[PDB]
Amino acid sequence: YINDKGKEVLVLWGIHHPPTIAAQESLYQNADAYVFVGTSRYSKKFKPEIATRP
Amino acid sequence: SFERFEIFPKTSSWPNHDSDKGVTAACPHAGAKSFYKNLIWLVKKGNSYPKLNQTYINDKGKEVLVLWGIHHPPTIAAQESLYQNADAYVFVGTSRYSKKFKPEIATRPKVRDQEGRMNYYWTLVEPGDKITFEATGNLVVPRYAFTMERDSGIIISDTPVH
Numbered sequence: 001y002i003n004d005k006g007k008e009v010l011v012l013w014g015i016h017h018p019p020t021i022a023a024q025e026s027l028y029q030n031a032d033a034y035v036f037v038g039t040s041r042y043s044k045k046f047k048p049e050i051a052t053r054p
Numbered sequence: 055s056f057e058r059f060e061i062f063p064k065t066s067s068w069p070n071h072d073s074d075k076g077v078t079a080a081c082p083h084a085g086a087k088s089f090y091k092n093l094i095w096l097v098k099k100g101n102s103y104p105k106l107n108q109t110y111i112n113d114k115g116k117e118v119l120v121l122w123g124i125h126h127p128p129t130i131a132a133q134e135s136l137y138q139n140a141d142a143y144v145f146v147g148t149s150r151y152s153k154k155f156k157p158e159i160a161t162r163p164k165v166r167d168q169e170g171r172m173n174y175y176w177t178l179v180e181p182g183d184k185i186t187f188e189a190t191g192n193l194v195v196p197r198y199a200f201t202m203e204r205d206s207g208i209i210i211s212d213t214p215v216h
Contacts, residue, residue, distance in 0.1 A: 049152070051145040051152075053186070054186055
C-alpha cells in the first residue's frame with residue numbers, strides 16, 4: 001500500500017501462533033511459514049511459535 | 055510476605071530425566087562441583103532425553119515468583135552429550151507470558167572456565183493462574199518458587215547491623 005494521503009497512516013496487523021502443528025496445517029497448510037512486514041524504516045520477519053499455551 | 059516453597063519436587067517431578075549430573079565447576083561448594091539450590095539442571099538419562107511437559111497451578115492466594123534458565127552449550131558435541139537433541143527448544147507459558155527459547159550454540163569468550171552460557175528468566179504467576187514448561191532440551195527447571203506479597207529499597211553500604 002502506497003500512502004497517497006497527505007499525512008500519517010496507522011496500520012495494524014496480527015500474527016497467529018497455533019497451539020499444535022495440526023492446527024497450523026489445518027489453517028495454512030504450511031508447517032514452516034513466515035511473515036515479513038516492511039516499510040522504509042520498519043522491517044521485521046515473524047515466525048510462528050507453535051506450542052500449547054494455558 | 056516471602057515464602058520459599060518447592061514448586062517442583064526433585065524426587066517426583068522428573069522421573070524420565072536425570073537430575074543429579076547437572077553440576078558445574080563454575081559454582082563450587084566446599085571444593086566440589088555443585089549448582090544453584092533453587093534450580094535443577096536436567097540432563098539425558100542415558101542416550102535419551104524424552105520430551106518434558108510440566109505445569110503448576112497457583113493455589114496460593116498471592117503472587118508466585120518463578121525462575122528458570124536456558125543453557126547454551128559452546129559446541130554441538132556438548133549439546134548432544136547433555137541433551138541428545140541438536141534441534142532443541144523450550145517454551146514457557148502463562149496467561150500473559152508466552153515465549154519460545156532456542157539454544158544459541160557457539161563458542162564464547164571464557165569466563166569462570168566456561169565456554170557456554172546460561173540465561174536466567176523470571177516471571178510472576180497471579181493467583182488462579184498456571185505456568186507451563188515444555189522442553190526438548192536446554193532447560194534449567196525451577197525447584198523453589200517464592201510466594202510474595204507487596205506493601206522499601208536496596209541500599210549498598212558496609213555499615214554493620216544492630
